[PDB]
Design a protein around this ligand. Sequence first.
Ligand SMILES: [Ca+2]
Ligand SMILES: [Ca+2]
Lengths: 150, 73
Amino acid sequence: SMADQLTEEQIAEFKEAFSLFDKDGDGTITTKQLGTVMRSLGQNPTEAELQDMINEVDADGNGTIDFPQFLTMMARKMKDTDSEEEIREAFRVFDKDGNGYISAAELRHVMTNLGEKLTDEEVDEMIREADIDGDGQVNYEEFVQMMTAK
Amino acid sequence: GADKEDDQEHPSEKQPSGAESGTLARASLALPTSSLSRTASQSSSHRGWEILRQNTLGHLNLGLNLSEGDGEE
Ligand SMILES: [Ca+2]
Ligand SMILES: [Ca+2]
């Protein structure tokens, strides 16, 4: 299996189950629907297990699950690394929506707090400078690379 | 007497095609107006990513030039 790598083929594998109930495909389901999605994830685990999943995601208590919170739970099961935290938190400070990518606005928030003003041209070119694959956006492994290598 | 042929093709199309659900919208946007592309160099300093990680690490940084300029309350 390649689920641990969370390849595009695999992200689609569980997204399909999530979107089965979310007809609009917006990426939002309620915890009432998550129990039904849990049936699509496996062979009907005991209610305590089913409940444990809805309980952790509904930490907020709003009854509704946004898609990156669904991903946060799975990513943690696949990664299992406690020392990665020095870098992960740094990414989360600016990644408030949790979409896993860096936009120019996210860097603007951080640099402003220092009381310094990076030019908008520098912030926009930083994304292309960091990115090595031409997609116009930077993900977590690309962000780690920035400091751990030249 | 003189005469000329007459044609003028001008159709319009209303037959729908290419349908799909197409259901999407976005909650937030930035739309900066400060952004422009006058630079030819298009260079950017690694400081932009460095400053982010130094401040969340809590690494000590110090600057003097940031004092002169527009004030703040
Ligand atoms: Ca983001
Ligand atoms: Ca990229």
